[model samples]
Target: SLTLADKVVYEEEIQKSRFIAKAAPVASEEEALAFLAENREPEATHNGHAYKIGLLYRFSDDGEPSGTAGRPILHAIEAQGLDRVAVLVVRYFGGVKLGAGGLVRAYGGVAAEALRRAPKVPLVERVGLAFLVPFAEVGRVYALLEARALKAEETYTPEGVRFALLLPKPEREGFLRALLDATRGQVALE
Candidate 1:
């Protein structure tokens, strides 16, 4: 229902072991992998990761024990009811051995704290829309778009200018009405 607005990182020393968790919003598995690739620490003892996009998710323990590092990180994301997000926990062994339970607590705790500290925003489902407006109505149409805070991509044609944009499904009807009234029905939906 919600996703991180930006990247965040949290660091802590647990039982002499250093743990760093990084969280970021991702739109797809590719983006998640890219985030992991960018943030994974090369010198860390272990680099664990978890990502959730709706029901689709993947987690990795890297070199840590099974179910201790990655699974706990995934649980932390799920606990917050987050989607379209990825988290990576990097650890540096500080001459202290933490058992399985301690590893889970340390990894999951750091990940949760990172996510908790990150800015979040609601996820909006948007539908793509294309319309053409005559040159005469371009100014009026642009005014309406600005009023609605909609940014549209524009292309010019001999007959008219084509505009492409996206609007949340719930607001599409109202937007369409306003578009029609603004252009006096001169704009044609493509």
Candidate 2:
């Protein structure tokens, strides 16, 4: 699966109503919520959303008819086979009423357009590792970390440093080897 690498927006007028779709990469429920909160247009007629964070999916119509808005947006997310992505479809009523079917098509179409515009990157698998380094080696290891093209989260403990690494699946083994070198071979795999 893939994740969006950039924010994308698509807008079009359908049946004299304005529909705007916004999408971005979202790795967690919190991030998805933040995006929805941040992107919401106060004057919009409705804000419908769907998101996929791994296998978990959630959506809301935000006051639109129940299934007409949210489910169709969800289908747009699923159709792209995307993970770690969120889509928000905002509508301006334009004083026109779209029956249920038209509403679905408008929301779904705008979301699909946003997905099509979004840039994507392959998913990276993350793994946690623990390392205990001598006081003298800590600086060296941190320096090594700065030099490598690695994404990791670090937590320092009295006994060691706990961390998570993100790498492409095929390159995981290769990255682990370098990790050992970075820690001066004083590490425990988790």
Candidate 3:
């Protein structure tokens, strides 16, 4: 089974027309479009879409001619080895139509080209950790958590300390073992 860190990745670029590519963490079309809408350029038109599981792709021209923009862009995204990702290409028109084929090439080319140029980084696995640490061990536990490269978001309560941690899936087992040793088995993890 592929882990989250090994499954999804992100890349972006600012080409002549300003293209943004966000590789999602899950295989969901709706999530991909939602991301595009949230990050879409306000001044420019949003020609955004996503590719879902089973090699499925959803796209839109954003009022552009049918098949001129969205489909080709989706093709370019798939041509590259990317999935669960959304590409939103915002064009300022540049006062040129570039014809149907030209539009497809432009839109797809911008997104593909941008992705080609951006640096690639591994996608970190998201973990849900609910832990309770006593007041005395909170400081030590926090330090240990950082040493293991865990992202711990904390909340204080009268009962004790509550925190959530996200870490790479491959490293989870080792991290859990270390935490258990450090906390002397006092920490409750869920």
Candidate 4:
């Protein structure tokens, strides 16, 4: 399930005449640029969008007047208390020009609405677990692993059966104990 904050980390691109709203999640300037490079349409004359998450916010209205597009989108994200995201709004000449205020409203409004509508999921910290088990015990280990609600992300063969698990940070110790007892110490936590 996504939280409100996570919903804010979404992307939307809207096209009206020459204007486009290109929004996405970004943790840094480099990522923002990468998104632009990947999502910017060849025919898009202008792209404007914003992205934000807890405390970080950034927006750009490709070639639009300064503060007319990007800033407003940033403000919208900030108003929602979002951080670690970025948005880029691109524009293509639609022959009609929306004045500065209109541009701000359009860019910001689209982003705001898209974020509001996006499904949000909580950010889960990655917790890694590596276990070594004998081949004969693999089935029992897997059953125990599932019973305890651990997601096994990977399995490998290296001298013995190796499995990688991902668990929420808070549940690590309890999961570890369950695995230990389930395998009766036959499996080693690597």
Candidate 5:
């Protein structure tokens, strides 16, 4: 997955009208809504916005013709494979009125351009694993973590040495293999 590397504000002229597109990285719906609320132009004829955070997404035409503004912006965000992002396009109408086709092109264009301006960063999905191992085996766990130069959360208890670790998705199998072998099946994977 990819997410916005930075916030971007872009403006351009289309069919004599000014289209301003603003985008920012938003991790939650509240943040996305806040960004949208801040960027929306009250004076503009239209302020269409959209956001994609994981599987949840929402958009609004903000009084623009149906399917002309918000949908295109949503499609543009998806096309870029971007998540945790909110995009808003404000259109100041010019003397010439753009038809539906023009509206789609304008909104999607500005949104895409804005995203392109903001570099993208990887959206890491880390997997969490919990374990309970004998105190003697705890050294091996910490050693495994040290060998991989990774960080883990550990807590000492009367029953055992309990710990939780977060690992990158691609590295999980290898980490588990190393951990299981290091403990010789004496470890409890919680």
Candidate 6:
């Protein structure tokens, strides 16, 4: 499975109804809700949305026909094997009643296309690590960590400085080896 690395937008007109689909990554349920709220079109006829966060998921038709808008959007997300993502399809009625089938196809098609075109990356688990480094090697450690774009919380002590880091599990081995090599074994992992 994969996760969205960037947000995507797609627009189209079906029959006469105009649809604007937006897809983005969400870190949690609250983030997903916020994304939907931020993109919802208040002036549009309908604002259908769906979000998937691992096993937890939700979809809302938002006044559209049952099983037409939201459900189709949800299906599109699942079909693409995307997680931690949310999709919103805002429809502006152009005086056309797209029947139930047409509604499903339009919503699902737009959402799928948006996700398909989105930037994605492999999902990886993360691990937290705590370590201490002597004062003399703080600058060296800082340089190495910054080079990798890794953020760490630092705490100063009489003997050394402690750092708390969150890193992708896959990179743990390489990170520790680099840390030891750079600090010349002056760092201790707690």
RMSD for all candidates, in order, please.
4.5, 6.2, 8.7, 7.0, 2.2, 4.8
Tens digits of per-residue lDDT for model 4, 85-173: 55555566656677887777777776676556655455455688888887777778889877776657656676568888877876788
lDDT of 2: 0.83
In model 1, where is the ten-residue run with the lowest total lDDT? 121-130
Give stretches of model 2 more than 4 Å off: 127-167, 170-190
For each candidate, the alpha-carbon lDDT, in order, equals 0.93, 0.83, 0.64, 0.66, 0.90, 0.92
lDDT of 3 by residue, 1-190 (tens): 2212222223333233444444443457676667677766677655554454445668888877888778877776667665555666766654444687777777777667655555445545566667888787787888997786666778887867888877777777888788789988877786
Error of 2 at 161 (Å): 21
Clashes of 5: 0
lDDT (tens digit, per residue) of candidate 2 on 6-97: 99999999988888899999989999999999999988989999999977999889899888888888898889888899999989988878
Sort by TM-score, best first.
5, 1, 6, 2, 4, 3
TM-score of each: 0.70, 0.69, 0.49, 0.52, 0.87, 0.69
User: Candidate 1 lDDT (Cα, whole model)?
Assistant: 0.93
Compare candidates 1 and 3 on TM-score and give the better one: 1
User: Model 1, stretches more than 4 Å misplaced?
Assistant: 128-166, 170-190
- Deviation (Å) of 138 in candidate 6: 23
Please give, for residues 108-179, the per-residue lDDT of candidate 5 as tens digits.
999999998898998878899888989888788888889998887888899788889888887888988888
Quick one: best TM-score, which candidate? 5
Off by over 4 Å in 3: 1-26, 120-190
**Candidate 4 ranges beyond 4 A from true positions:** 1-18, 53-55, 124-190
Q: Report the Cα lDDT for candidate 5.
A: 0.90
Q: What tens digits encode model 1's per-residue C-alpha lDDT throughout 1-190?
A: 7899999989999989999999999999999999999999899999999999988999999989999999999999999989999999999999989999999999999999999999999888899889999999999988999999999999999988999999898789999999999888988898
Worst 10 contiguous positions by lDDT, candidate 4 = 1-10
lDDT of 2 at 152: 65
